[PDB]
């Protein structure tokens, strides 16, 4: 298994690492039909989503999508520094695949 | 895919944005039959609900409704500032579709 | 839908409002068979339960019963002020139907 | 329904009350197969388990077992004082049936 | 049942105890397909995973794997000291089987 987010991210196509080293500036979540998603931003203007679950996702990802939204909410509320995000860059906003937190 | 709450809200019929920029004043939840819901208020008097799950909701919204009540409870307890709510205005109290949190 | 806990409470028989305006003094939880319940008290001694799920409950209430126990535990640990409880008074201890928190 | 943990405990065979009036000293949890359980200790050395779910358990206890592990973890992390435990004493470590927390 | 993490760990083949007595330095989680996992590190460089649920795991472990990831997240965010990890050391990074928190 990968030992860090960068190596993990590199195992997939259409991804990139963003380095934030900053707490989340805003947290948005929606229960509206077909937009059951979360959106975060950072003070540098960067915006990211956790995608609406869809046919691109495999079954094993469903619980992990829900966990990620849990993680972003509590990170936001505790002002935890986000080190890096692994994202898919073929979506707008870029779609979160992985998160690391440090410092 | 929308990049913020305002753009997301605009995709739906019978919605509007309320700007609060304030912590939640009160949090109420019920387990009584047919009233399994949450109600929040702000010190300006504004009252909002998370609706009881019903036939106006698609399968994908059900988990998101449960998440929203989780979010409102922990926002209330941490005194997190609510920036905006996207609501359906064809319900009373107006029914929450989305929330953004920021300072 | 109801604007507040008092109006919600009045939609049901065998209920009353207790106004506490105080934090929970004690929290008790059981996994023992046929007693899978929570009990709370306030400083004055008044005692309330979240009932064991039973025949009186409709299916939609089951997730709400679990949420209520989650709410009581975190309210207890954070010393959140409980404003009101809506309770069924045909049980002993009185059985919680709804809770409002406000500072 | 019982008004408190001591009365609840007395409804069962093979139980006793431990009065700790102390925070949890250590919290242990395992995902290893057939040992999916939690263990806590107190500074006095007293050790308690949440049992692995088994044939002795009824369906209604499954969620409550998960909830108790949730409760012990957050009590441990918040340094919440544990008042009493109701335990089954026909197991080693003694198996938790119920917990009370008070200031 | 085992009374502590060291004795639990010894019940299994291909395990060892690591003694950290330190808070988690970094927390990483992924929702990417086939890498639905968490990774933690300590400041001494030690790196550990919660393995992706697979066919090595029995059904009772599935909920416990999710719980473990919940625990590591909240331990990280609260700066809780991790005492020991029981790991399988036939995986790289070593795969977490159990955790103890004290002190
Ligand atoms: N859009 C609809 C909005 C209006 N709603 C729907 C209709 N509601 C009233 C209909 C039922 N009224 C009740 O008072 C009621 C119903 C049920 N149901 C079946 O049993 C159970 C009740 O109490 C027990 O069950 C209670 C738990 O639910 C508790 O245990 C109590 O002690 C028992 O006596 C009480 C009012 C609110």
From TrEMBL, chains A, B, C, D, E:
Binding, beta-D-galactose 2: 56, 61, 90-91
Residues the entry annotates as binding alpha-D-galactose 2: 51, 56, 61, 90-91
Residues the record lists as binding beta-D-galactose 1: 14, 61, 90-91
Residue numbers binding Ca(2+): 79
Single annotated GO MF: metal ion binding
A single GO cellular-component term on record: extracellular region
Glycosyltransferase recorded as keyword: no
Disulfide linkage: 9-86
Keywords assigned: Calcium, Metal-binding, Signal
Ligand binding (alpha-D-galactose 1): 14, 51, 61, 90-91
Keyword Calcium: yes
Residue(s) carrying Cysteine sulfenic acid (-SOH): 9, 86
Name recorded for this polypeptide: Cholera enterotoxin B-subunit
Gene that this sequence comes from: ctxB
